[PDB]
Design a protein around this nucleic acid. Structure first.
Ligand SMILES: [Mn+2]
Length: 192
DNA sequence: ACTTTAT
DNA sequence: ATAAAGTATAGTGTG
């Protein structure tokens, strides 16, 4: 099976939408409401605090510069962490939890533990997956541009699958220099 | 490497 | 007027 890891840039304006989905505050034909109690959150975060509020307070309190966070700032990079169904069918509940906790560890150790703003695991859709918001805050500065550039995303695609298999998980990296285009969830569904 | 942003 | 961070990136699946 392939390791699926990819980020989506979150500005202020789409964090409300991310929170609404991640915390199940609504539904979509592919969400089994009976299975939603099965989801879990891997961080210590407060469920009654928006992501937009949480991240802004954290950055505003920690930043070296006196300038306000720009309105088009990438407040976080939401990584999807997943694989195919076959990969998951092989794992019990405990192993599935370890898998996501392990993925979270990679990003904690590489980009700062205090930057993992949420790590929300969904078992009530088609396949287990985690929406994990990594705040690109380093050296007192917030910059997705500085944290996740071309070389860095290339590095993750090689190193993260390796780190997972080093920790017990049988999955391989995606095709090197893969020519695929990201489809949206809704666009992937039309494709099937 | 070219714009937008908050000074 | 200045400089940091915006824009993409790399990967596969019914997020
Ligand atoms: Mn989901």
């Amino acid at each position: 099976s392939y390791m699926v890891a990819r980020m989506q840039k979150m500005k202020a304006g789409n964090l409300g939408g991310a929170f609404k989905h991640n915390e199940r505050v609504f539904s979509n034909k592919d969400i089994n409401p009976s299975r939603s109690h099965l989801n879990y959150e891997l961080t210590d975060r407060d469920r009654s605090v928006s992501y937009e509020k949480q991240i802004k307070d954290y950055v505003n309190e920690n930043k070296v510069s006196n300038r306000a966070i720009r309105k088009d700032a990438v407040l976080c990079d939401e990584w999807i962490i997943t694989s195919d169904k076959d990969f998951f069918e092989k794992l019990d509940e405990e192993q599935t939890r370890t898998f996501f906790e392990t993925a979270k560890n990679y990003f904690a150790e590489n980009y700062g533990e205090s930057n993992i703003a949420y790590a929300s695991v969904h078992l009530d859709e088609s396949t287990p997956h985690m929406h994990m918001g990594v705040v690109p805050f380093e050296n007192g500065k917030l910059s997705s541009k500085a944290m996740f550039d071309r070389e860095e995303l290339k590095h993750i695609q090689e190193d993260l699958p390796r780190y997972m298999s080093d920790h017990g998980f049988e999955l391989e990296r995606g095709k090197l220099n893969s020519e695929a285009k990201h489809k949206t969830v809704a666009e992937f569904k039309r494709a099937m």
